[PDB]
UniProtKB/Swiss-Prot annotation, chain A:
Belongs to the caprin family. It is found in: Cell membrane. The lineage of its organism: Eukaryota, Metazoa, Chordata, Craniata, Vertebrata. Homotrimer; via C1q domain. Found in a complex with LRP6, CCNY and CDK14 during G2/M stage; CAPRIN2 functions as a scaffold for the complex by binding to CCNY via its N terminus and to CDK14 via its C terminus. Interacts with LRP5. Interacts with LRP6. It comes from the Eukaryota. Residues 19-44, 82-104 form a coiled coil. Transmembrane segments: none annotated. Promotes phosphorylation of the Wnt coreceptor LRP6, leading to increased activity of the canonical Wnt signaling pathway. Facilitates constitutive LRP6 phosphorylation by CDK14/CCNY during G2/M stage of the cell cycle, which may potentiate cells for Wnt signaling. May regulate the transport and translation of mRNAs, modulating for instance the expression of proteins involved in synaptic plasticity in neurons. Involved in regulation of growth as erythroblasts shift from a highly proliferative state towards their terminal phase of differentiation. May be involved in apoptosis. Detected in all tissues tested with highest levels of expression in brain and spleen. This is Caprin-2.
Curated annotation (Swiss-Prot), chain B:
Residues 11-38, 76-98 form a coiled coil. The lineage of its organism: Eukaryota, Metazoa, Chordata, Craniata, Vertebrata. The gene is CAPRIN2. This is Caprin-2. Transmembrane segments: none annotated. The chain holds residues 119 to 320 of 1127 of the full protein. Belongs to the caprin family. Homotrimer; via C1q domain. Found in a complex with LRP6, CCNY and CDK14 during G2/M stage; CAPRIN2 functions as a scaffold for the complex by binding to CCNY via its N terminus and to CDK14 via its C terminus. Interacts with LRP5. Interacts with LRP6. The C1q domain is essential for the function in Wnt signaling. It is found in: Cell membrane. Promotes phosphorylation of the Wnt coreceptor LRP6, leading to increased activity of the canonical Wnt signaling pathway. Facilitates constitutive LRP6 phosphorylation by CDK14/CCNY during G2/M stage of the cell cycle, which may potentiate cells for Wnt signaling. May regulate the transport and translation of mRNAs, modulating for instance the expression of proteins involved in synaptic plasticity in neurons. Involved in regulation of growth as erythroblasts shift from a highly proliferative state towards their terminal phase of differentiation. May be involved in apoptosis.
Amino acid sequence: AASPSQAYETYIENGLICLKHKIRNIEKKKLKLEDYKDRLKSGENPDQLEAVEKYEEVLHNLEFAKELQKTFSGLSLDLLKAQKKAQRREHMLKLEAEKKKLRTILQVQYVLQNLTQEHVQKDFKGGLNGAVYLPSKELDYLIKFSKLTCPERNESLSVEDQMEQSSLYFWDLLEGSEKAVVGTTYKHLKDLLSKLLNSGYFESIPV
Amino acid sequence: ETYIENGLICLKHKIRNIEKKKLKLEDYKDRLKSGEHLNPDQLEAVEKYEEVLHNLEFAKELQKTFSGLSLDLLKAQKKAQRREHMLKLEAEKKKLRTILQVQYVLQNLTQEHVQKDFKGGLNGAVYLPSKELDYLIKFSKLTCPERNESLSVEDQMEQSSLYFWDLLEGSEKAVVGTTYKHLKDLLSKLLNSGYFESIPVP
């Protein structure tokens, strides 16, 4: 249970305490080597003698490590705010798409609602009054699907139950997947409805 | 500085930089043993050889850890993306079903005989004072308007979709003399009333 932000936050924090732990570990052996140095200076094994030679290496490694630590400790917000900004822009783009998806569902609903009507179906069957001709097979997909998305009120179902079933059909249709439905696919139906939406037929429908 | 690769602190470029200087210094040293004569600057760089070897081993040790932090971060982001996508998908399917429900209610509130039931609490209807019912009627004109051929279908649907969105959000922004919050509450009351499970026929 964590968001993409707190993950990156945990990564930045884990990086800083990483340098802290590494610097403290270098400084620990520096003090261990400085005690090995003062032991021989006052007058006092071979293996240890090998460690005291790396005192310059250990001291230089500490110079680099403290350099990165001060750099990254300030460089945090440069990569941390860039993350916050990139997430904000991401969320807004997704919000936009969500709002546009809702508009699209309502447009499609409007087409499917009118396709339940007899005079509208006859127009697409005969290619009449500005409708695009649909072969009887194609028109049947839309009629059948209009009964799944715009059913007449079925009082044996609860409102909530009926709305949920209709909502799933609108959702899958918008997904345009290859799943099967009323003898075709959602993808085919999403294309059919696009043509109908762009045909201009549904801009004004007589009585 | 170029320590960053896709937002992650990566010393890889510095490691290959240090390694290139190590190979360049190893070449200078071999040309020395063979008998070549180098300008003074190159002679100085040759004395920095052991330091370069130490820096390389230290940088390589740091990359061993920063690569793990990078892997741990990527693993966590994969999980968090999956979780967020899951929740947001279920929240969207729920919002849409809710939208279809309130749409059904608001579309039925345009009918006058249904307004009459809520005026006096007739049948299964919640009694609403006429000001409360007015809020809903005016809102029903914004969410379920009669077709306005001055507008395209797309433009009309866009207008309507915003009112549904702001309704479900339930903010305090003003609309038809009340707020989306209060409207959301009224419509929740109407949904829980059961009146719209079986609308009476006049």
